[PDB]
Structure 1
Amino acid sequence: NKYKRIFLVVMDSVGIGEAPDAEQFGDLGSDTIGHIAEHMNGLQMPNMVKLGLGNIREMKGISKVEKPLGYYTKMQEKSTGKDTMTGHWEIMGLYIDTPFQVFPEGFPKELLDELEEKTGRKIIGNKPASGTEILDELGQEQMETGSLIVYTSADSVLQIAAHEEVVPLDELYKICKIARELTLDEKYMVGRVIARPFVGEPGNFTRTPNRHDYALKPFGRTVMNELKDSDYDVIAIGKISDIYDGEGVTESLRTKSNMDGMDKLVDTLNMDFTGLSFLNLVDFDALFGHRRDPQGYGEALQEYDARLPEVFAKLKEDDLLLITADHGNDPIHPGTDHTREYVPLLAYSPSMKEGGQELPLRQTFADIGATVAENFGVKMPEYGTSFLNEL
């Protein structure tokens, strides 16, 4: 192998400007990093700058440097959708024609009618909501009537809440499985069906740890599958395991925050493995992008950038670091959905003694997967062109 370990970091939703097909998505003018840099009156990301972020594109506070630490370019998304699952599946070598759907006005009557017909239960709610808000609103009705609370978030999910002492847990899971089958349909395709059992009483409802997720498997065998099948290590940190429904994963490290994600990254750098360490930093998307909060987004980016010198100090000569994103989620944009954007790509190894250069623009995210596959000598994915030899 040219690299013994590859550390792949997805900064979730950290887009670097509207993509060529942005218009098809109503995403003209979108620019995640750029609008944040403007809001902040200049972003302080000196370590990303040293890697060459500003060389990809200059933005307020983010300037190009003469001798970037690593190689740099941006990546264009080829798949139809702009959701997390699509982006990640493409990164690991897939092409996804069918987008996952979001439901800002709740779910179509047709879907809910079929779920009712298959379960024998009424459905109440049917709107985007936090799990807390929705429980206070409808928790008591749910208890009294044996109804299912069905709701969504700004993401592609269908959540089903039910009191544990009214609807038995195993029945809630059965219902979620029925919903999971019904939602395998392009009309209403959800990335994730989530059981949200709760207990307590009106004015004091708490969601229990008996939560279960029903994700779809990637539409194809990924580069992670191939690494795993060739006895390499595939360490998933954060949401990565869930995003791929565990496919190709040899070890999974739960995280509770961006800083916690960086701690786990540091843990893997202390590990003697051969293969891929794969981190998703999710706060950018879940806490700031969807909530349209450029101030908190900007602070999160600075907090993350400050963690980077430790990562640099720990990389070995045969380690490669890859930093990218999976779409945009511009916090100064209409609505609550993702934005169709280019994503940055930074590729750094301490063995690059002369620094890096610009790479040709990556025409699919799958170039990352192809690079990983070629490095480890596993079967090349169907999509993607490796840039391994450019490094």
Structure 2
Amino acid sequence: NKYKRIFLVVMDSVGIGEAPDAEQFGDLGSDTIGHIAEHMNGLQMPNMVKLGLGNIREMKGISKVEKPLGYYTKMQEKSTGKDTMTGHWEIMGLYIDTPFQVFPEGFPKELLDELEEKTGRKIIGNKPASGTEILDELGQEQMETGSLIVYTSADSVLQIAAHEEVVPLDELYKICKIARELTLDEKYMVGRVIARPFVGEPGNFTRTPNRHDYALKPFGRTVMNELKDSDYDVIAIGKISDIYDGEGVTESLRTKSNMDGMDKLVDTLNMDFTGLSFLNLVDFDALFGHRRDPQGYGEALQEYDARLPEVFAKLKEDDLLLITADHGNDPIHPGTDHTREYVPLLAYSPSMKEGGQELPLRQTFADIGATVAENFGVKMPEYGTSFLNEL
């Protein structure tokens, strides 16, 4: 094998400019990194610059270098949707025709009607809201009526909140499983159903750790499945295990923040493994992209960049570092949804003694999966073209 360990980092939502098919999505003009760089009066990302980020595209404060540390290009998404699951499933070798839906105006009446019909309970709320906002507003009504608070976020989720002393936990879980079945329907395909039990009294409600998620498995066996089946390590960091519903995962490391994510990445560099360490840095998307906060996004990008030299120092000759994203989420764009953008690709190993070069544009995110598969000698995915030989 060319590399003993591959470290794959998804900077969630860190797009590098509108894709050729952005118009279809109402995403003309989108540019996640570029608009952030303009907001910041120049982004300070010297380490990503050293890798070749500016060689992909020059942006304010992000210039090309003559000798990038590794190879660089961008990737184009082939799957229909621009959600996190689609992006990640494509990265790991799939093609996803059916997009996961978001619900800025709540769920269709047809779906909620069937959920009421199957559960024998009324549904209230039906809007995007934070857990805290929706409980403050509707918690008391929920307690008094035995209704279900159904809500969403800016992502593809359906959340059901019920008080633990009013709706027994096992009943809430049964209801969520019903909702999970009803939402395997392309009219209202949600990525994730989430049980949101809460306790307390009016003016003092708190969600409990009895939260449970109901995810969909990837629509196909992924490169991760193939690595696991061939007795390789597949270490998932952060949201990765959840995104793939555990498929192909041999170890999962929970993270609480981007900095904690980098700490866990460092933890994996310190581990003797053979296979894949796969990190998702979610703060970019969750805290900054969706909240349309270019300042916070810029600061987070600078915080992430400052962590990289330690990663560079720990990489061995037979390690490969891959840095990419799963879509865009331009924090100066209308609405609250993701944006259809190219994503950067940087590929670096210390064994690249004369630095890197430009790779041909990756025509599907599955080029990553194909590269990982070829490296480890496992079954090649149906989609994707490996760039292993180019490195």
Deviation at 1:124, TM superposition (A): 0.2
- Separation in structure 1 between the aligned mates of residue 143 and residue 303 of structure 2, nearest angstrom: 43
Q: Counterpart in 2 of 1:57?
A: 57
- Separation in structure 2 between the aligned mates of residue 102 and residue 379 of structure 1, nearest angstrom: 34
User: SS where residue 346 of structure 1 aligns?
Assistant: strand
Deviation at 1:288, TM superposition (A): 0.1
Deviation at 1:104, TM superposition (A): 0.1
Deviation at 1:92, TM superposition (A): 0.1
User: SS where residue 162 of structure 1 aligns?
Assistant: strand
Q: Counterpart in 1 of 2:91?
A: 91
- Separation in structure 1 between the aligned mates of residue 181 and residue 335 of structure 2, nearest angstrom: 29
Q: Counterpart in 1 of 2:282?
A: 282
Deviation at 1:204, TM superposition (A): 0.2
- Separation in structure 2 between the aligned mates of residue 177 and residue 308 of structure 1, nearest angstrom: 41
Q: Counterpart in 2 of 1:366?
A: 366
- Separation in structure 2 between the aligned mates of residue 71 and residue 232 of structure 1, nearest angstrom: 25
- Is 1:106 equivalent to 2:106 in the alignment? yes
Q: Counterpart in 1 of 2:41?
A: 41
Residue deviations 1:20-68 (CA, integer Å, cap 9, x gap): 0000000000000000000000000000000000000000000000000
Deviation at 1:308, TM superposition (A): 0.1
- Separation in structure 2 between the aligned mates of residue 85 and residue 334 of structure 1, nearest angstrom: 22
- Separation in structure 2 between the aligned mates of residue 360 and residue 58 of structure 1, nearest angstrom: 17
Residue deviations 1:117-168 (CA, integer Å, cap 9, x gap): 0000000000000000000100000000000000000000000000000000
- Separation in structure 2 between the aligned mates of residue 55 and residue 314 of structure 1, nearest angstrom: 24
Deviation at 1:300, TM superposition (A): 0.1
- Separation in structure 2 between the aligned mates of residue 223 and residue 136 of structure 1, nearest angstrom: 44
- Separation in structure 2 between the aligned mates of residue 153 and residue 133 of structure 1, nearest angstrom: 12
Residue deviations 1:335-359 (CA, integer Å, cap 9, x gap): 0000000000000000000000000
- Separation in structure 2 between the aligned mates of residue 162 and residue 364 of structure 1, nearest angstrom: 41
Deviation at 1:360, TM superposition (A): 0.0
RMSD: 0.1
User: Under a length normalisation based on structure 2, what TM-score does the superposition of the two structures give?
Assistant: 1.00
- Separation in structure 2 between the aligned mates of residue 321 and residue 308 of structure 1, nearest angstrom: 11
Deviation at 1:239, TM superposition (A): 0.0
- Separation in structure 2 between the aligned mates of residue 38 and residue 156 of structure 1, nearest angstrom: 29
| Fraction of identical pairs, as percent | 100
Residue deviations 1:229-282 (CA, integer Å, cap 9, x gap): 000000000000000000000000000000000000000000000000000000
- Aligned structure 1 segments of 4 or more residues deviating by more than 4 angstroms: none
Q: Counterpart in 2 of 1:146?
A: 146
User: SS where residue 361 of structure 1 aligns?
Assistant: coil
Q: Counterpart in 1 of 2:173?
A: 173
Where in structure 2 are there 5+ consecutive unaligned residues? Answer: none
- Separation in structure 2 between the aligned mates of residue 39 and residue 52 of structure 1, nearest angstrom: 22
User: SS where residue 372 of structure 2 aligns?
Assistant: helix
Deviation at 1:290, TM superposition (A): 0.1
- Separation in structure 2 between the aligned mates of residue 365 and residue 320 of structure 1, nearest angstrom: 17
User: SS where residue 141 of structure 1 aligns?
Assistant: helix
User: SS where residue 279 of structure 2 aligns?
Assistant: strand
State the aligned residue count: 391
User: SS where residue 8 of structure 1 aligns?
Assistant: strand
- Separation in structure 2 between the aligned mates of residue 206 and residue 241 of structure 1, nearest angstrom: 26
User: SS where residue 307 of structure 2 aligns?
Assistant: helix
Residue deviations 1:164-199 (CA, integer Å, cap 9, x gap): 000000000000000000000000000000000000
User: SS where residue 7 of structure 1 aligns?
Assistant: strand
Residue deviations 1:277-319 (CA, integer Å, cap 9, x gap): 0000000000000000000000000000000000000000000
Deviation at 1:6, TM superposition (A): 0.0
- Separation in structure 2 between the aligned mates of residue 211 and residue 138 of structure 1, nearest angstrom: 18
User: SS where residue 285 of structure 2 aligns?
Assistant: helix
Residue deviations 1:82-110 (CA, integer Å, cap 9, x gap): 00000000000000000000000000000
- Separation in structure 2 between the aligned mates of residue 55 and residue 218 of structure 1, nearest angstrom: 33
Q: Counterpart in 1 of 2:160?
A: 160
Q: Counterpart in 1 of 2:387?
A: 387
- Separation in structure 2 between the aligned mates of residue 18 and residue 187 of structure 1, nearest angstrom: 26
- Separation in structure 1 between the aligned mates of residue 297 and residue 171 of structure 2, nearest angstrom: 39
Deviation at 1:228, TM superposition (A): 0.1
- Separation in structure 2 between the aligned mates of residue 73 and residue 138 of structure 1, nearest angstrom: 48
- Is 1:304 equivalent to 2:304 in the alignment? yes
Deviation at 1:222, TM superposition (A): 0.1
Q: Counterpart in 1 of 2:254?
A: 254
User: SS where residue 187 of structure 2 aligns?
Assistant: helix
Where in structure 1 are there 5+ consecutive unaligned residues? Answer: none
User: Under a length normalisation based on structure 1, what TM-score does the superposition of the two structures give?
Assistant: 1.00
- Separation in structure 2 between the aligned mates of residue 31 and residue 201 of structure 1, nearest angstrom: 44
- Separation in structure 2 between the aligned mates of residue 333 and residue 206 of structure 1, nearest angstrom: 33
Correspondences of 1:1-391 after superposition (within 5 Å): 1-391=1-391
